[PDB]
Every structure is written in structure tokens, then in C-alpha cells.
Design a protein around this ligand. Sequence first.
Ligand SMILES: NC(=O)c1cccc(O)c1O
Ligand SMILES: NC(=O)c1cccc(O)c1O
Ligand SMILES: [Fe+3]
Length: 175
Amino acid sequence: STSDLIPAPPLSKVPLQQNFQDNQFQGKWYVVGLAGNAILREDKDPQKMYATIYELKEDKSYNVTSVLFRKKKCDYWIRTFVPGSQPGEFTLGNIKSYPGLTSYLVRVVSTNYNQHAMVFFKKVSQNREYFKITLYGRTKELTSELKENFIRFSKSLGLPENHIVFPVPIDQCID
Ligand SMILES: NC(=O)c1cccc(O)c1O
Ligand SMILES: NC(=O)c1cccc(O)c1O
Ligand SMILES: [Fe+3]
């Protein structure tokens, strides 16, 4: 009957990467950090690293493919990111096609493009408001400085530590 969620922060607390270069953000990113109001640390079966590949289509929206190793198989999900209100911001394509999804926002918070990135996502599904922040790495490992920054930025949006996880590097599928 009931769900309880930490509220999405106001967008004014989410920076946008200045001068965003869509072409340079393309390619494979490993998710080295993951935080959000629906993300929970689980020492029982710790979360395994997955990857997200961004490809710019001719119309400039992105074809985003995520690949995860689950049940001994590689599982692929594709979504389309459509340029939104400002460079570095996106909305989700073919939303009708997702049952219950009424809003989905993507905001690139910061990236140097060839090593790391921090992306904020907010969506409203079945009337519940979810938000998450991904710390992307061009490699599966990042400095402890970047990880700490991600932790501070996640806390600054209301998230406690048990809502921040560092997926464990694997070789299956994401290589
Ligand atoms: N549901 C998923 O498996 C998923 C994977 C990567 C990125 C996302 O936004 C997702 O929702
Ligand atoms: N699973 C989630 O909590 C979530 C939150 C914001 C955006 C997304 O794509 C998500 O998948
Ligand atoms: Fe999602």
C-alpha cells in the first residue's frame, strides 16, 4: 500500500555542465558510482558494475544502450535521450511506450569527457518521484577524490550513505 521516498531535490541544487559537448560525451561509460532515493546498499548481493554507451544519432538525440550482467546473461536496455531545454539536459523519447512514466529528465552535472562524469536523473513513474545520480568512469576505477566528490554531491541532495553504492567491477558483458 505504502512507499516512502526521500524527495527529489529542487533542480536549482543540480548544476549543469557548462558548455556541454554532445559529440565528446559519446561512447562507453562505466557506472562506478550510483546513488538515488530508490538505490539501497545491499551487502547480501552487492550491486555489479554495468555500462552505458551513448551514441549520437544524426538528429542529435542519443541512442543510449545499457548493458548489465544478470542471471548469467548480458541484458541490454535502450533508451533515447532527446535534447531538452539547454545543452547537457535531456528528456526521454517515446515516453508513451513506458507504462506509468509521465516525466523523465536527464541533466549532465559535470564531466571532463575522457575520464569521468556525474549525471542527474529525475523521473515520475506511477506518480512517485525518483531521482538518482550516476558517477561515470571511462575506466572501471576512479580516484578516491572523484568518488568522495560524488559522495558529497549525493549527500547535498538529501541522500544518506546507505543510498550511495559503488558497483563492483566485473568483466562479463561490459568489456
Ligand atoms: N532499469 C535498468 O535496468 C536501467 C539500467 C541503466 C540505466 C537506467 O536508467 C535504467 O533504468
Ligand atoms: N531506478 C530509479 O530509481 C531511477 C531514478 C531516476 C531515473 C531513472 O532512470 C531511474 O531508473
Ligand atoms: Fe532508468
